[PDB]
Symmetry: C3
Subunit: 323 residues, 3 copies
């Protein structure tokens, strides 16, 4: 008999408490958040006893939500089209018959010939950009990169509610930019993030990550209850490493890619500088949903709540009557 009143309290609390209140059934929700992100990196480093600025280590440069900060390089200066032996021992050859299709991808096409790369070693000859890259000793990382800064201008808009806000507040001043200390909880509206800080929030050691290369994700969540104050709608920053496989795998441990700088002589012959770039890739991911009170969902939701509590008490009353 008392279980009837208990079931009544559980139905009333669930349908009018969790379902109606905690789940904000009284609210209209806009999930089609409109976002824009623009980035700008600042910092200088020493690599190969040359200074490197944003135009040197950031790629691509258009300042989108995805960019790489190069932290390590294998530089192959002044390549030219020709014939030459492969560098890595993986291509060791003793007989021209060993230079066949079974060989792994290399600097160029295989001539089928076999040449002496050094007095000690002989490898397969190739036609392509010469000489081939040599990966014998590890190259250093750009330590200063740990201090580079990432400027994030993130604009968001829930169009359903014609609501627009950004991580740059309207009262932001040049002094603020010069002196604010970003923190996900303490100061979410500082547009400057320290690269080393982002790396550590992601649970990574800058030395290792910069040695191997990797992909970090900067997630910005705008979950805003537009019923509350405009100043309560704040961004929630989360950080992670997206190439999680890389750490668990020995075959491919990081992130790197190759690109070239192309030159011509007055003579007119082409020559290029090859670059194997290791770096940290930053992905800025913006998500959000908004909700504001609307009478319609309050009517439908409350009516559904009364029909739900009524159906509940009715079914519990019947099941109690028969048993």
């Amino acid at each position: 008999g008392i279980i009837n009143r208990v079931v009544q309290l559980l139905i009333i609390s669930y349908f009018v408490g969790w379902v109606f209140l905690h789940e904000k059934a009284y609210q209209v929700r806009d999930t089609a958040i409109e976002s824009s992100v623009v980035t700008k990196v600042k910092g200088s480093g020493l690599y190969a006893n040359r200074v490197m600025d944003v135009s040197d280590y950031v790629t691509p440069p258009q300042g989108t939500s995805v960019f790489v900060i190069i932290t390590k390089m294998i530089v192959t200066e002044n390549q030219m089209q020709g014939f030459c032996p492969e560098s890595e021992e993986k291509y060791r050859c003793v007989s021209d018959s060993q230079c066949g299709p079974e060989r792994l991808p290399g600097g160029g096409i295989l001539t089928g010939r076999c040449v002496n790369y050094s007095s000690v070693l002989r490898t397969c000859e190739i036609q392509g950009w010469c000489p081939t890259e040599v990966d014998t000793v590890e190259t250093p990382i750009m330590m200063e990169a740990e201090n580079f800064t990432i400027f994030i201008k993130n604009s968001i808009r829930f169009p359903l509610f014609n609501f627009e806000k950004g991580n740059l507040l309207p009262n932001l001043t040049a002094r603020d930019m010069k002196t604010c200390r970003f923190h996900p909880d303490k100061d979410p509206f500082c547009p400057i993030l320290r690269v080393g800080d982002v790396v550590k929030f992601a649970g990574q050691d800058f030395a290792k990550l910069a040695r191997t290369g990797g992909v970090l994700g900067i997630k910005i969540g705008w979950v805003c209850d537009l019923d509350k104050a405009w100043d309560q709608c704040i961004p929630k920053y989360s950080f992670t490493r997206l190439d999680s496989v890389s750490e668990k795998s020995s075959v491919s441990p990081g992130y790197n890619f190759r690109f070239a700088k192309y030159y011509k002589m007055e003579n007119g012959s082409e020559y290029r500088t090859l670059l194997k770039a290791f770096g940290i890739r930053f992905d800025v991911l913006v998500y959000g949903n908004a909700g504001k009170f609307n009478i319609i969902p309050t009517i439908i939701s409350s009516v559904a709540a009364f029909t739900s509590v009524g159906v509940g008490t009715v079914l519990c009353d019947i099941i109690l009557l028969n048993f």
Copy 2:
């Protein structure tokens, strides 16, 4: 007593009208729209008394759904690695003690020394790419850019219904491309959009936007009722400015980025041309959902409608009986 019939009409109309008809409950919905976008910009401009074509002002060039049309530039010709004084007055120095870590990011690393940039001004010395960029007088914009054209090939497919359509209709002809006048309502299937037109649909003044740089969004919505004719499935174009913060903020008012063109001498020394690019970034965002009649959701939906109207009339009859 009459309120019973009134509640019956509201239940029947809601559950069989809005819920069943207006909300197309009889329809199966495909929301996993598959989209592809390819772009090509055309136009030429005069900047620095040089002609600039797509290969000069568009970046990146692969013709994806995101590209920049550069409208303004600060060009720093023939930089070389070395030592030189900072250009901007923000780095004004009188004592070598003022050249310390508290200085903002600059063209290069700080030597700690202090040098005379000009007879009137002395600033901190740096090691890096020299000379530093000078932002003393504003550079002009490429006015002709207002007339550039954006060619958008947008392919979409709802795989659930094996339905494929694109903004390029199959009966599109070379004359059409040469002469069609795009309009979101009047002619949605013209693949050529005037840059100035896109800027104005976004509610922007090309002169100012091209002066500051900005991000414009071109939204293409494919909301198609596959029950109706194939020719009723048309794209809905919307335009906006995505970096909405930029206009409300004095600290960062637009969109720009820096990149360099790299050269070598026959002598073999590296030198580069630095570029501070202001431009309009275009983001083509494609969204859509499709629906087609399927008997299953018609059965489940109609049965739910009858159970709903029945439960409604039952509860209203009981509440009327007790009170």
Copy 3:
């Protein structure tokens, strides 16, 4: 009378069979899948009797989920700023009055003058990068591209369940990479995909696709029932052509774009090599949802199932009683 028991079996089977079991109502679902993709292409080709490696034909190079493999080129060597006649016959001119605004976009700005491109043909003069591109005879494709390989490191994580898996399994070895044969069904965990294979899975002929250029989509779906074994969570590969309009349209049949390589003389004058690139663009699209048993949705779902079967038998009993 028997239809009462029939309706009872249909209600019990639907609400406790399809709705509760097949639809995994007992499961909590994570749809906010977190994905990261990194790519690396390998292969060499012969084009213009030059060898071309990843740094030559892949763009952009940062190894993101979207990249192009260039398969065809129209190369315009050593352009310089100046005046010259238009190449294509579309610009045929006989009178300087015909060189007006009605002309289509061209290599540069129009001088209004008219010049002889050849003894046989006269066209409009332009100021810009000279000479203009000549598209008279078709250029060959890089046949070897059919054998290039795409290395895909895809990391995914459902954070709700703190679940992380990737297409590179932890027991992957160098021999595996050197010898595994990717197949969507037979071997989903081989990170190496043959370009020609991807083209054919997409239902395309490499010769034609490489002639016109196109966009291929590589969809990777992680639909995982975390109740089952960790080894049951496997990626589902799908392949398609995303620019479906291109094949059905005569006006624009493929995918290509233009970019330039910039050079300077010791003299200091700028000159560039123009490139019209035809290639296959690969879009790696990752989707997924996960589900794991949770007691809460089992309670709510089972209670909803009993209330549903009860309401069903009640309404069928009443409708049977009155009629």
